[PDB]
Symmetry: C7
Subunit: 243 residues, 7 copies
């Protein structure tokens, strides 16, 4: 964070860093937290959709976006930048079915959106995207990817982006199981969101989507199908939040 | 608001912000306030058209613009920038009927104008549009959208842009009803404008347009058809303005 | 007017302004004043053509320019910039007759020249035009438009640009009538120019052009046809200038 | 002349000026003075060709350039810039005979060279031409034009550019006659040059070219045909220079 | 490392250096160390894949990448930059089989990726890749190449990149044999990694790939086939680490 | 020579100058002096080819270059820049014979190379050529041209460029005759070079080329054909150098 | 070496210099020295290939590069830049055989690579090549060329580039003979390298290539064919190094 080397994406600092990329990362920190958790039977995406005003048509707010029948995605960072990236992913998913006449894999999609972001990182009159993404889906096996403003790509078993990344990360870091069940993964995910917010959850102010190995079809969970999971989740959240 | 990071749209500040976008937002704050309110049977747009001079051909001043038969729009911020954005929306509405041989939805239109604005946000020799828009219309259900200089897009039930956003927003925040009637929404809207200006309204210095679910046809209200609503509105405005 | 934000057209100031546009406006303030006045039967344009030297071939000086048979225009600001804008308007008028095989309206012409100016306002290696224009003519009804360096467009009943805008504006603001007659409008216009200059007029050092609803044909007034109007005008100018 | 706003042609100063254009004008001030005088029967161009060295092949020095059979031109300012502008005018004269199959008028030529100069005034990586021109000729009537580095264009009866503009201008301002004769105009012109230099003239160190209404054919005057005029001119110059 | 000459890739310093390239090299220093060792029967690549978190799907982490059947590669430096370079190498390998209908050599591949990197070193709006690569394979004889952010290319017998370059380099510098055997080269390589980390190795947190002269086919070694080598390696590492 | 206005070719100084052009001129001052002298029967070019080392293959050093059969040229300033300019002239000479199927004149060639140089004077990312040229030849009459880094073009009877311009210029200024003979011009030229160097000449360390009106064919003079002229030249040089 | 004028290749200093070019020259000074010596029967190139590490596959290190059957070349300065320049020369050699269906001459090749380097010297977003080259070969007669980062080109009888240019140059300056024999030239060359390094030579740490008038075919000398020459060379080196 040294002046003189931090206001031009194309300039390296004396200790080999791209401060404009690090600064862009500060933008995604401010976003509502989005969680991703994978298990044996599928992958889940949980996002916080609490709004500060009742004037917002929250009945139409979307935090988890369908990219293709089997690909899923969450967002964090600059709003407009995020939307553009998601449309880009969708277009990319369509191009694939045209060129190879088959659906694109989660890995290839995440990889293409990240190569795109990487380019907005090494040219002078260009600003990097101020957003991170969670790309989830099911190819032959479930998949969970996390992107970075610089274009870096990492595959996780469970993770998060936005305000509560730290909390969620440490929690999963201490209680995530390589063998959890879909419903366990679901609950564990909601609990995480809970610690993250430091409050019991309200099924109507959190969005959940997933893709299971059987259907390979993305689908959002209704607050009704979601209520039972929140109830169980709130139990432990309550139990852990201030003993 | 820190020098060194606030005079280039492509530069992030150390705390992850785009000050040139925030400054652009300062431009829309200076504009005449435009209100948007949605209800069961339709959506309404109310704009303040008071002029500081009698030399202006106010008989031809337009604050609410028809984009298509069912799409409506209000503006706030840099004048020339605004006009360009509205022509862009219209062109976009025509392209849709050509390509898909069907009318564009409110969501898609707002979405396309915002993707356009987003791009004037991440390239070096480009200035962001200094304006916010209220895109209103009726697809299958009424719709009210608010845009931002950065390209962000939000759906509301009721909101505002320009000088009186705060006032109008807090008022609606305390008395907007998810079940109001067209005429109620209308009056509530005029009242808001009233508090905003801190004065009883004059039907001839405010413009109102709307789109109802039945006709799906935009139409402006004549000061005559509007006079009764102002009278009722001024009653409450009078009652609330300084008790 | 704060250093740091005023030397790049694409930079917004902290209070949301485009200082380079405001500075450009300072250029039009220095120009000879041009007046525009509309009435029932037509529109009139009056410009001051007094020169500081007898060496100038003033017998060929033009302050009011014909754009098309029914469109008229005056200028104020940087000289070369102005000429370019007028040729642009003419070309634009020709393109219209080709594309739509019909004459362009005053509104559309003013609108196209302003969209052009707006663009020289949001790109990095471009300077805004330092000039304002008065576009006058007759479509179905008389028309008077005033342009701005930023591309803003406004329709007036009567107005002015250049040095004497203030004077002329306040005068019209106090004595312009929505029902004046051509000859009244003419005299009122000359009087304004008079106050503006603070001196009785000399028919040979002022240029007048107009477009009436009947002919829809632009034409300049000879100093002979103009002398009677000046005489009457000088009467009131004399009467008002220092009582 | 305020630092901060004077080293980029595209930047307006707080008081609406283009200092780089004003600075460019400082370049033409340093050039040998060129005079232009028009009369009933034609137009004349007189240029000072005194050189500081005998090594220069002054027998081939040209200060007045033929553009076309009826168009004439003088120069002042940066040398290389000037030459380029004159070749541009010639090319422009040829293009006209091709496109419209008729000779270009003096007005149109001057107008085209000025629109060209105007453009080198509103783009970032471009330097304005540091020169002014006197374009003279005969269309239906004699013509005398003066150009500016910014692209401004003015028509005169008599004028000058370069070092002695002031002197020559004030002199013509006090003794130019709208009805002078060719020979009178000629002498008056030489006298002006005289005051300008503050010395009697030497026919061999001044170049004169002209275009009369009868021939509409440009031609230079030999020092022999010119000697009689200088003699008469030197008489008055002598009479006026230090009484 | 002198300010004034170190923030523009195209600027040479007074002592003839490209500081932005030197700074880019500081980025590769921070990466996990990758080792390369060549012997009579083939070439080996060893990379450290220890992760700081159990949440990373390390079961899918790749530090050694297959470029073609006979070409191998390791990476160090900016993550996104590295991935882009490897895809570039693969594309380059395919182009070769198309154009010359034969596999590209290791030398030609390394050479093409380095010419590409060199270009991102001499143009103004371009940032150099912050990564070094180890390109290994078998043409007629085994090959080991090391790249630099500047595009420099060097052929080694044994070497390394990343954090432990120094350690590994000095070790090989004192005990590398021009005649070692595959298994010896393997062990020597693991030992180096050991000193580098200052700890006995764990077969599961190090990745090894190779290409032998017989098969000319790249293949990764399983932690099981690798365990015996680690055991022997840890013996000497233990023996050398703090006597 | 004022900081703030002297490091960008496109910026005019407050007193209307292009300092980068004046600085470029400082480069030609450092070059070996080249002399040009014209007479009745032809034009001559004399250049100093003294080298500071015997390791240079001076037997192949060329200071006077043939452009075409009748066109000749000398150089001074940046070496690489000069060569490029001469190849440009040659190409230009060939283009002429193709387009007009006739040889280009000296005037047109010099004019084309100068228009080219002028352009490297008014664009932002371009450096001006740091060289002056002496273009000599015979069209209908002998010709001698001198160029400038800015693109200015002047015709002389006798002149020089490089270190000894002053000396040579003053000498010719005092003893050049408009009627000298080829051999006189030759000797006078060598004498000049002599004063310039302040030493008697050595035929082998000076290059002479010429073009006479009869042959219109360029040809270099052998040190043998040149020895007699040097002998006579050294006589006067000796006589004038320190009396 | 004055700040303010030394960090932009396109800027001239007040005393007419291109400091970025002079700084680029500082880069070639740091390179291993390469020597070039010409004689009656051919041209020789000697380069120092001593490495600081045994890990480098020096058995494949190349300091002298074949450009074509008769053209040879050595390098000094930035590594990556050098390689690019040599590939450029080779491509250039191939283009020639295609276009003129004949081999390119040494002069033309050197000339083309230098015109290329000259261009990376006068454009704003471009960095100059930090390298000098020795281009050697045999056309009708042997040839030895030395290039410069600025694009300057010089022909020598004997010379050098890199660290030991001074030493080697002074030595040749005192003992080079215009009539030496191939073997003499060879020995003299090795001696030079010797003084340069201040140590007797080791045939295996120096590379020698040559092109004789008879074969016109480039070929490298084996350390075995080279050992006899080193032995003789070391004799004199020993004799001269510290008497």
């Amino acid at each position: 964070p040294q002046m003189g080397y931090d206001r031009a994406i194309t300039v390296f600092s004396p200790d080999g860093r791209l401060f404009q990329v690090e600064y862009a990362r500060e933008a995604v920190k401010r976003g509502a937290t989005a969680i991703g958790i994978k298990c044996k039977e599928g992958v889940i995406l949980i996002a916080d959709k609490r709004v500060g005003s009742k004037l917002l048509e929250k009945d139409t707010i979307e935090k988890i976006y369908k990219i293709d029948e089997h690909i899923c995605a969450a967002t964090s960072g600059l709003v407009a930048d995020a939307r553009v990236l998601i449309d880009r992913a969708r277009i990319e998913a369509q191009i694939n079915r045209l060129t190879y006449d088959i659906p694109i894999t989660v890995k290839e999609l995440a990889k293409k959106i990240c190569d795109f972001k990487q380019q907005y990182t090494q040219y002078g009159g260009v600003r990097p995207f101020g957003v991170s993404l969670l790309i989830a889906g099911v190819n032959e096996v479930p998949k969970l990817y996390e992107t970075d403003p610089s274009g870096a790509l990492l595959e996780y078993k469970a993770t998060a982006i936005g305000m509560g990344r730290m909390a969620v990360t440490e929690f999963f870091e201490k209680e995530y199981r390589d063998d959890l069940s879909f419903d366990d993964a679901m609950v564990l995910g909601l609990v995480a969101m809970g610690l993250s917010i430091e409050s019991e959850l309200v099924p109507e102010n959190i969005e959940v989507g997933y893709v299971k190995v059987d259907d390979r079809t993305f689908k959002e969970v209704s607050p009704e199908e979601l209520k039972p999971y929140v109830e169980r989740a709130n139990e432990r959240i309550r139990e852990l939040l201030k003993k």
